[PDB]
Amino acid sequence: ETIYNTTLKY
Amino acid sequence: EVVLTQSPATLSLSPGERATISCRASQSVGGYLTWYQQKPGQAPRLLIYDASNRATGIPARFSGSGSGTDFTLTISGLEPEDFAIYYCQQRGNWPPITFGQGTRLEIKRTVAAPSVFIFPPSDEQLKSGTASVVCLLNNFYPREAKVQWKVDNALQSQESVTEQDSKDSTYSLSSTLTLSKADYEKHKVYACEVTHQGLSSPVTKSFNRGEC
Amino acid sequence: QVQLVESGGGVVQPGRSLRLSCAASGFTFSNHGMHWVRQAPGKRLEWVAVISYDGRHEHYADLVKGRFTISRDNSKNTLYLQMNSLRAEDRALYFCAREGLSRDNSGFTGLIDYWGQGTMVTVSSASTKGPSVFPLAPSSKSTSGGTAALGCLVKDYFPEPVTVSWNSGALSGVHTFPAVLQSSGLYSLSSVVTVPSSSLGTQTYICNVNHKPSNTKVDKKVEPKS
Ligand SMILES: [Cl-]
Ligand SMILES: [Cl-]
Ligand SMILES: [Cl-]
Ligand SMILES: [Cl-]
Ligand SMILES: [Cl-]
């Protein structure tokens, strides 16, 4: 799987 | 929300050519811009993310550029499978996640004038109290076409257009003018006036109610 | 190959509800955030909602707020979309989709990478109704060269879809147009076909129309205008 940046915090 | 607007709406190209599609945002999303490919009624496919990164399995002819509010998708050496709809998506300022209105990549071909035909209402329909008149535009290109109903010389319906023909890549259009039978009988001339780039001058197909 | 199979769509009345299901396989469901995105006929993709991998955080598009609820049952690898108080403008093709993984799991990525095939939702107060099939008679006004156009007007039916074939399928030259939603709330479509004008005597042309929702089946013969 490719890993991406989170753009919306929980 | 961050509104995404693409340009152009439709791009007419043929295999081997280069497609250039733009996507502009109302405000910055940094480089968090994604490009998708989709065919009508089908599952979208991820092509590029973060403006220029190609997704797993995506071929080199697909490239992206831009940042903030101005982006560009480029597809060189176009192949058959590439003719589809392309959408940009942003994940830089959400919720809500937003998408562009899409850009269609259609198969290019030469000008083709439409064959215009007209159909009066059937006897069965008139019995029921309604009258639908149909104007048909067969196999023309390009897709833009001005179809106007003219009744007794006066401008007035609903229409729909087919996908590009599997064989000649042309379009066909059907327009239906519906009236109550009472109104239908008040008029005498029913015409469909067609303005299209394939015709040196507008074509008016007409019939007079009751003429034999 | 990720597999997302949707179901639960259909036709519903305004004010009523539906609950869509999205069966996932081909990836570790419990590790990925999931989304619902909709697309109205001829319109662009509109994001609907998102839910975290563990179903503990959710976000909605203003338009469905307080009406729709996104949830998931990881044991069943199923994502849901509860749709209450449906409105006509909620009509659209609904897609479920997964988003890519984040590196630190501090939040969503918003990277919608794999999508399902979609399930259709139609909201209308129209009653199920079969179509009236009227002939579009070939005539001097529908002929060009040695070719004549004739067809069938499949009018006033609900809901979609209908199928049309000519001479039980024996008939190139068919152009069955996209249905059109009328002001009445009923659909209407035309299917036209071009044939050699020289055949108008010799050959009988019949359009076979089927509208499964109303169990309607009609074979209307289309004769040259008189
Ligand atoms: Cl990223
Ligand atoms: Cl936004
Ligand atoms: Cl880009
Ligand atoms: Cl390539
Ligand atoms: Cl219902």
Q: Which ligand is nearest to the CA of C113?
A: 1
Are B89 and C141 an interchain contact pair (Cβ–Cβ within 8 Å)?
no
Are B97 and C117 an interchain contact pair (Cβ–Cβ within 8 Å)?
no
Residue with tokens 């535009």: B137
User: How many angstroms is it from C11 CA to the middle of ligand 5?
Assistant: 7
Q: Are residues C3 and C104 in the same domain?
A: yes
User: How many angstroms is it from B72 CA to the middle of ligand 3?
Assistant: 5
List the 1-10 stretch of A: residues with Cβ below 8 A of B.
2, 4, 7-8
Q: Are residues C41 and C102 in the same domain?
A: yes
Are C106 and A10 an interchain contact pair (Cβ–Cβ within 8 Å)?
yes
Q: Are residues C60 and C158 in the same domain?
A: no
Q: How many CA atoms lie within 13 A of C19 on its CB side?
A: 7
Q: Are residues C58 and C22 in the same domain?
A: yes
Q: Are residues C146 and C210 in the same domain?
A: yes
Question: Rounded to an integer, what distance in angstroms lies between the CA atom of residue C137 and that of residue B132?
Answer: 13
Q: What is the DSSP letter of C128?
A: P
Q: Are residues C148 and C43 in the same domain?
A: no
CATH number for the domain spanning C89: value is: 2.60.40.10
Looking at B33-131, list the stretches that DSSP marks H as alpha helix, in order from N- to C-terminal side: 123-127
Question: Rounded to an integer, what distance in angstroms lies between the CA atom of residue B154 and that of residue B179?
Answer: 15
Helix or strand holding residue C205 (H, E): none
Q: Are residues C10 and C115 in the same domain?
A: yes
Experimental method: X-ray
Q: Are residues C13 and C108 in the same domain?
A: yes
B143, B10 Cβ separation under 8 angstroms: yes
DSSP B187-208: --EEEEEEE-TTSSS-EEEEEE
Q: Are residues C1 and C38 in the same domain?
A: yes
Domain that holds residue C35: 1-125
Are B97 and C35 an interchain contact pair (Cβ–Cβ within 8 Å)?
yes
C174, C166 Cβ separation under 8 angstroms: yes
Domain boundary among C125, C159, C190: C125
Q: Are residues C155 and C65 in the same domain?
A: no
Domain boundary among C68, C101, C125: C125
Number of domains, chain C = 2
What is the separation of C-alpha C63 from the centre of its chain, rounded to a whole number of angstroms? 21
Q: Which chains touch A (3 or more CB pairs under 8 A)?
A: B, C
Question: Rounded to an integer, what distance in angstroms lies between the CA atom of residue C12 and that of residue C123?
Answer: 5
Domain boundary among C88, C110, C125: C125
Question: Rounded to an integer, what distance in angstroms lies between the CA atom of residue C74 and that of residue C33?
Answer: 11
Q: Are residues C183 and C195 in the same domain?
A: yes
Residue B45 phi, psi dihedral angles, 5° rounding: -120, 135
Chain breaks in chain B (C to N over 2.5 A) after: 156
Q: Are residues C148 and C200 in the same domain?
A: yes
B171, B164 Cβ separation under 8 angstroms: yes
For residue A9, give the nearest of C101, C103, C106 by CB distance. Answer: C106
Q: Chain A residue with minimal CA distance to C52? A: A10
Residue B82 phi, psi dihedral angles, 5° rounding: -75, -20
Residue B182 phi, psi dihedral angles, 5° rounding: -60, -45
The domains located in chain B, with CATH, are 1-109 (2.60.40.10), 110-212 (2.60.40.10)
